Amino acid sequence: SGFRKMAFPSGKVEGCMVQVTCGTTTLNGLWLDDVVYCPRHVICTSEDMLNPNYEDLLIRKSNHNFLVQAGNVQLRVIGHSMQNCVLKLKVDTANPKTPKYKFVRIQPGQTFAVLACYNGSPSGVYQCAMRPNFTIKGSFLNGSCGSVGFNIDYDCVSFCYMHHMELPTGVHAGTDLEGNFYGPFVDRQTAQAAGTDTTITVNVLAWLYAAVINGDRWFLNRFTTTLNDFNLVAMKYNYEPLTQDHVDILGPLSAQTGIAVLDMCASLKELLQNGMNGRTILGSALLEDEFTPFDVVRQCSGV
Amino acid sequence: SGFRKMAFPSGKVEGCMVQVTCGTTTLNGLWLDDVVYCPRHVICTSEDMLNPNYEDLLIRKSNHNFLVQAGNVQLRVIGHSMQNCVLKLKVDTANPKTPKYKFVRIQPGQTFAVLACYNGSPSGVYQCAMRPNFTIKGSFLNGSCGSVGFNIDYDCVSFCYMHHMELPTGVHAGTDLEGNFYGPFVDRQTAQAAGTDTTITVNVLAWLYAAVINGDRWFLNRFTTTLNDFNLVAMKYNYEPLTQDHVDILGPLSAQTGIAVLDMCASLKELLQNGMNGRTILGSALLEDEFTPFDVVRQCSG
Ligand SMILES: *[C@@](O)(CO)[C@H](C[C@@H]1CCNC1=O)NC(=O)[C@H](CC(C)C)NC(=O)c1cc2c(OC)cccc2[nH]1
Ligand SMILES: *[C@@](O)(CO)[C@H](C[C@@H]1CCNC1=O)NC(=O)[C@H](CC(C)C)NC(=O)c1cc2c(OC)cccc2[nH]1
């Protein structure tokens, strides 16, 4: 038993992390087969980042302008190209530790593991959720760009995020591995705001089921609600709407606890209107929304 | 910026997890050099775990009774021994993925990464804090014994925890890599209770230093205190007493912010006696006690 935010093992990703340097600008790259993926703004200087014409700055660069370091060995760049905001550097050596992998664009509300790296060296790993406003609440410092987010299904690593930016509010923004940003952000040195953040309702419900499976039932109530009436209250409290697909996705958790999804909605409705009154749920004083139904099932099945 | 419960990358430990099976009992082992370490109760039968005499049980075991597998490849056992609650199985193959490592016994309050493992296959990694009552609030299922907790300094892996037991309350207990249980538990199929838990004072102070570093410093007062006066006060609010080592590992943060440790102790004392008065610290009205002074520096420095 027990329930904590838990990331997939990062070993298969650590073996792909490299360092990319152009001028006095350094960040992390991802080395899969004979191509290294990194944020394209590595080709910028301090002055270029204010408003960079990347296509312009890229044609003016030569292969030998890119220093790529895999641990202690230097990889030779034998070609370069740009796909959206991601620079792709072909190299003379294929990474022998390349795992079975795929590039996936994650949906808002879904979770992934983040391997924070600095100077091409892994530093830490933690779970994040792609929030509705397409930011993530991570822990990134200077030099963390190029760090990637991922999940692992059996032995296949699905890469879904590469880090680029920290917003003024302290949250973080990035691209998928095709170089497309999540959210309306742009890779220029400007202060950018995200859209209004909402709470991932299906995740809050799943996390409440995790509390019941771990013995916490104090928030339950005898009342029930309709899907529409719950959504009215949810939208009022800046919660994402709950769809029938979400109700279907919550089925297994409902069958294990014997609590109908719409019964848990009434319990969440009361929590939103009455509050927790100082009480805690699974140790938290706030309603947690960064656990997916999958995340919960994978720690609370059999308990 | 940003504060997360962050775990060390698990790759150096993933390459060391194996599966150990005796009869039908399977759990996880740690393969370092030519030795596999694992919980000794792997030699017990289902009905035998009520009050095992591990010394007699081991007498009835030979090298050929132990099935050690890295993946599906069997590692031949060429010797066996018992050290406290851990079994050391000498194997014929030295693990080529063995990292530079050491065995450490952590103190209550310190944090470490836990690599959840099942049938020798890593499944997840998360960060834990060793409670003052020698328990960790983790996520462990059937088959998780033998999973290890660890820290990584540069390229050295410091192993500090091997999982053994889930308590009736849902928290977990285990040993260091020398087989010595953290806390007053024993490897036996019985419901054992942990001592009443307390708040990790040293970590709360680290958290306050973190708030100061970020410009959130309303709680700094004009008082100071002796270490003894603070301890006696802290024990009345279910807070751990501080040691000399606790004062010492707050040194870097005290020097970074210019706030003497005992001045911050006096600030904490005020918060304990008078509450927060609706105010928040780093966006929360609850004082957090699962980040060590090192975790704070790592996430404010780099
Ligand atoms: C990468 O490491 C750059 O290689 C870096 C990521 C962080 C720095 C601190 N915390 C992080 O996660 N990314 C940046 O510095 C990006 C650069 C590219 C061009 C987008 N810039 C920002 O993240 C950024 C710029 C500004 C800003 O301007 C002026 C004003 C306010 C916030 C801000 N963030
Ligand atoms: C290991 O996997 C055993 O190999 C297993 C750990 C977990 C199982 C589920 N969640 C875990 O963390 N360990 C045990 O089952 C141990 C075996 C001991 C070391 C011999 N037993 C317990 O942890 C345990 C026993 C009892 C009990 O008795 C009866 C009564 C109440 C709780 C309890 N926990």
UniProtKB/Swiss-Prot annotation, chain A:
Residues 1-303 form the Peptidase C30 domain. Changing N142A: Does not affect ability to cleave and inactivate human TRMT1. The active site is at H41, C145. It catalyses: TSAVLQ-|-SGFRK-NH2 and SGVTFQ-|-GKFKK the two peptides corresponding to the two self-cleavage sites of the SARS 3C-like proteinase are the two most reactive peptide substrates. The enzyme exhibits a strong preference for substrates containing Gln at P1 position and Leu at P2 position. Changing M49A: Does not affect ability to cleave and inactivate human TRMT1. Residues 1-303 are cytoplasmic. There is a cross-link at K5, K90 (Glycyl lysine isopeptide (Lys-Gly) (interchain with G-Cter in ubiquitin)). Changing P132H: In strain: Omicron/BA.1, Omicron/BA.2, Omicron/BA.2.12.1, Omicron/BA.2.75, Omicron/BA.4, Omicron/BA.5, Omicron/BQ.1.1, Omicron/XBB.1.5, Omicron/EG.5.1. Inhibited by pyridone-containing alpha-ketoamides compounds 13a and 13b. In turn, alpha-ketoamide 13b (tert-butyl (1-((S)-1-(((S)-4-(benzylamino)-3,4-dioxo-1-((S)-2-oxopyrrolidin-3-yl)butan-2-yl)amino)-3-cyclopropyl-1-oxopropan-2-yl)-2-oxo-1,2-dihydropyridin-3-yl)carbamate) inhibits SARS-CoV-2 replication in human lung cells. Inhibited ex vivo by michael acceptor inhibitor N3. Inhibited ex vivo by compound 11a and 11b. It comes from the Viruses. It is found in: Host cytoplasm; Host Golgi apparatus; Host nucleus. Cleaves the C-terminus of replicase polyprotein at 11 sites. Recognizes substrates containing the core sequence [ILMVF]-Q-|-[SGACN]. Cleaves and inactivates human TRMT1, preventing tRNA guanine(26)-dimethylation of tRNAs. May cleave human NLRP1 in lung epithelial cells, thereby activating the NLRP1 inflammasome pathway. May cleave human GSDMD, triggering alternative GSDME-mediated epithelial cell death upon activation of the NLRP1 inflammasome, which may enhance the release interleukins 1B, 6, 16 and 18. Also able to bind an ADP-ribose-1''-phosphate (ADRP). 3CL-PRO exists as monomer and homodimer. Only the homodimer shows catalytic activity. Interacts with host FBXO22; this interaction promotes the proteasomal degradation of nsp5. This is 3C-like proteinase nsp5. The chain holds residues 3264 to 3566 of 7096 of the full protein.
From Swiss-Prot, chain B:
Changing N142A: Does not affect ability to cleave and inactivate human TRMT1. There is a cross-link at K5, K90 (Glycyl lysine isopeptide (Lys-Gly) (interchain with G-Cter in ubiquitin)). Residues 1-302 form the Peptidase C30 domain. Residues 1-302 are cytoplasmic. Cleaves the C-terminus of replicase polyprotein at 11 sites. Recognizes substrates containing the core sequence [ILMVF]-Q-|-[SGACN]. Cleaves and inactivates human TRMT1, preventing tRNA guanine(26)-dimethylation of tRNAs. May cleave human NLRP1 in lung epithelial cells, thereby activating the NLRP1 inflammasome pathway. May cleave human GSDMD, triggering alternative GSDME-mediated epithelial cell death upon activation of the NLRP1 inflammasome, which may enhance the release interleukins 1B, 6, 16 and 18. Also able to bind an ADP-ribose-1''-phosphate (ADRP). It comes from Severe acute respiratory syndrome coronavirus 2 (2019-nCoV). This is 3C-like proteinase nsp5. 3CL-PRO exists as monomer and homodimer. Only the homodimer shows catalytic activity. Interacts with host FBXO22; this interaction promotes the proteasomal degradation of nsp5. The active site is at H41, C145. It is found in: Host cytoplasm; Host Golgi apparatus; Host nucleus. Changing K90R: In strain: Beta/B.1.351. Inhibited by pyridone-containing alpha-ketoamides compounds 13a and 13b. In turn, alpha-ketoamide 13b (tert-butyl (1-((S)-1-(((S)-4-(benzylamino)-3,4-dioxo-1-((S)-2-oxopyrrolidin-3-yl)butan-2-yl)amino)-3-cyclopropyl-1-oxopropan-2-yl)-2-oxo-1,2-dihydropyridin-3-yl)carbamate) inhibits SARS-CoV-2 replication in human lung cells. Inhibited ex vivo by michael acceptor inhibitor N3. Inhibited ex vivo by compound 11a and 11b. It catalyses: TSAVLQ-|-SGFRK-NH2 and SGVTFQ-|-GKFKK the two peptides corresponding to the two self-cleavage sites of the SARS 3C-like proteinase are the two most reactive peptide substrates. The enzyme exhibits a strong preference for substrates containing Gln at P1 position and Leu at P2 position. The lineage of its organism: Viruses, Riboviria, Orthornavirae, Pisuviricota, Pisoniviricetes.
